[PDB]
Design a protein around this nucleic acid. Structure first.
Length: 580
DNA sequence: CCTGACTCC
DNA sequence: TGGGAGTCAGG
């Protein structure tokens, strides 16, 4: 705990070396248009702290930040990059991101500050951010000498930890996953977040006004049916109405009381008509609270854009997540909610939304990894995979598959990927459990390679302690040999599912990198707006639709080569709603 | 604050 | 007794 550093008043030349650890500190969790509170640089020549007002107005330092040949090691470079974009400054030459390095080494550690990464290599000459800034209403930037030391210690940590982290990644055969996939993707996500998505607020506000009316009507219908007013949004009060007043059967309990889950309420419809009304109300209520009000609260009013933050270092499987607002859970399944998408529009006149989605990428990945002959052959023929499973399960010709049979078979196909049990499948489909069990037993008899994969992958997890994806992402599963059935079983389902979900994540991430390259190469104005796990959303001048119709699916389908084809569907239109 | 509701993949 | 997420109101 004896670290010399220079608290500089102006920028000097020795601060602009062609390799440095750089800290551009943004303390607000949402870094969009957020203040930069301080800057640290550590390099061959020493350690430096700079005041943003100085350094970000210094044409020399700004030149250095944007010089691609001046290499920077950072932690969470996307945060710095975006915060600098809001200040009108370009950051290039980031060659190492410790956040992403830590994430690839072990997603379970939940590393979100430099101290937590440093802990992976027993480096303790740096403090947690929460310790320096405090939490909640106590959160605050400390006095300059304290801030400065903290920023410098974070930079010094990055400086000393780069080699050890790269050394383990390389030993794990994950170094390319970092340098050629995650770090390039970070820059692309930075572009997407900063560009944002334009919102039709007049349309959203009108929809909210009508929703309020409808909510009120449904609400009063519910009180009439219930014979009493209560808070419908309180599972506790609801549970009293349903299971005590109306004496409906109790199908499930949770740790706190009667369950009122959608699954449960659906099964109560043969008993009382009120449950259907209540489901409708809770649906409409979430629309109003989250997709009207919540969304309007985060729109930047002068530009009418919303700027999500894609968390790249959070999920245990390699997926992104999306926050403040979450733009990866915009309604689509019910027409009532789907119309929310009418409010998501192009950012320029005479532009259109272009949405491209992988068809059944998880099942194609399963087919590939399990190398199951019958499943691979179906995909090579582009036979409807749900129709095919229905034929095997029910043992019928293709022309005998009722839409109900296909409905059930779809539930089987997707459920196998999550390790569904017969209980779960019976409840999902609301069918006989004896029958549900027979569906699963017949599925594995028809796709024996999948059965072998599920057995082999759990054996692998037990022997190695972790499972891996196509592009060498890992997930450690230290509970896989627990003597406790629930704990062990959950870990076995993670072993089964993670190579599937995680490889699908790998593939779309690489597609984004390849797509951006192709877009720039061809000087197209089109650009990415969102990723939604197995979907990519873009906007572009209307003139460019013809090109994207060929280019986007092609790049997505060719991202990796599997033993089965990848297939991508696509649509475009005047709003996200219309891109279907 | 957690829990259980809704939303998405 | 179904894998991975985030936000919301109620309590």
């Amino acid at each position: 705990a004896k670290m010399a550093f220079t608290l500089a008043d102006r920028v000097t030349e020795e601060m602009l070396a062609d390799k440095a650890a750089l800290v551009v500190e943004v303390v607000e969790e949402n870094y969009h248009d957020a203040p930069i509170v301080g800057i640290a640089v550590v390099n061959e020549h020493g350690r430096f702290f700079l005041r943003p007002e100085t350094a970000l107005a210094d044409p020399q330092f700004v030149a250095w930040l944007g010089d691609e040949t001046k290499k920077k090691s950072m932690f969470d470079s996307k945060r710095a990059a975006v915060a600098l974009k809001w200040k009108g400054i370009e950051l290039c030459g980031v060659s190492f991101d410790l956040l992403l390095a830590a994430y690839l080494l072990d997603p379970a550690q939940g590393v979100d500050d430099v101290a937590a990464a440093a802990k992976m290599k027993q480096y303790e000459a740096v403090r947690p951010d929460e310790a320096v800034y405090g939490k909640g209403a106590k959160r605050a930037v400390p006095d300059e000498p304290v801030l400065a030391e903290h920023l410098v210690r974070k930079a010094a940590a990055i400086w000393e930890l780069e080699r050890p982290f790269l050394d383990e990644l390389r030993r794990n055969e994950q170094d390319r996953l970092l340098v050629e996939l995650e770090q390039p993707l970070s820059s692309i996500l930075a572009e997407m977040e900063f560009a944002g998505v334009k919102v039709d607020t007049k349309r959203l506000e009108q929809m909210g006004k009508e929703l309020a009316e409808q909510l009120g009507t449904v609400e009063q219908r519910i009180y009439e049916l219930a014979g009493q007013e209560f808070n419908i949004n309180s599972p506790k009060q609801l549970g009293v109405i349903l299971f005590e007043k109306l004496q409906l059967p109790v199908l499930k309990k949770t740790k706190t009381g009667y369950s009122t889950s959608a699954d449960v309420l659906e099964k109560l419809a043969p008993y009382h008509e009120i449950v259907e009304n209540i489901l409708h109300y809770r649906q409409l209520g979430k629309l109003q609270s989250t997709y009207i009000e919540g969304l309007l609260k985060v729109v930047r009013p002068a530009t009418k854009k919303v700027h999500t933050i894609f968390n790249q270092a959070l999920t245990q499987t390699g997926r992104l997540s999306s926050t403040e607002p979450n733009l990866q859970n915009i309604p689509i399944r019910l027409e009532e909610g789907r119309k929310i998408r009418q409010a998501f529009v192009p950012s320029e006149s005479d532009w259109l939304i272009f949405a491209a989605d992988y068809s059944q990428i998880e099942l194609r990945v399963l087919a590939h990894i399990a190398e199951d002959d019958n499943l691979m052959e179906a995909f090579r023929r582009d036979l409807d995979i749900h129709t095919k499973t229905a034929m095997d399960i029910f043992q019928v010709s293709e022309d005998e598959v009722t839409p109900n049979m296909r409905r059930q078979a779809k539930a089987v196909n997707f459920g196998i990927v999550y390790g569904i049990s017969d209980y779960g499948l019976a409840q999902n489909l609301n069918i006989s459990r004896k029958e549900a069990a027979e569906f699963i037993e017949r599925y594995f008899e028809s796709f024996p390679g999948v059965k072998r994969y599920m057995e082999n992958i759990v054996q692998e997890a037990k022997q190695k302690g972790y499972v891996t994806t196509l592009l060498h992402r890992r997930r450690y599963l230290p509970d896989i040999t627990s003597r406790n059935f629930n704990v062990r079983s959950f870990a076995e389902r993670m072993a089964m599912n993670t190579p599937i979900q995680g490889s699908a994540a790998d593939i779309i991430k690489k597609a984004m990198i390849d797509l951006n390259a192709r877009l720039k190469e061809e000087r197209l104005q089109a650009h990415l707006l969102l990723q939604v796990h197995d979907e990519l959303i873009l906007e572009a001048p209307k003139e460019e639709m013809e090109r994207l119709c060929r280019l986007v699916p092609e790049v997505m389908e060719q991202a990796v080569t599997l033993r089965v084809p990848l297939k991508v569907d696509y649509h475009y239109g005047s709003t996200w709603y219309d891109a279907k």
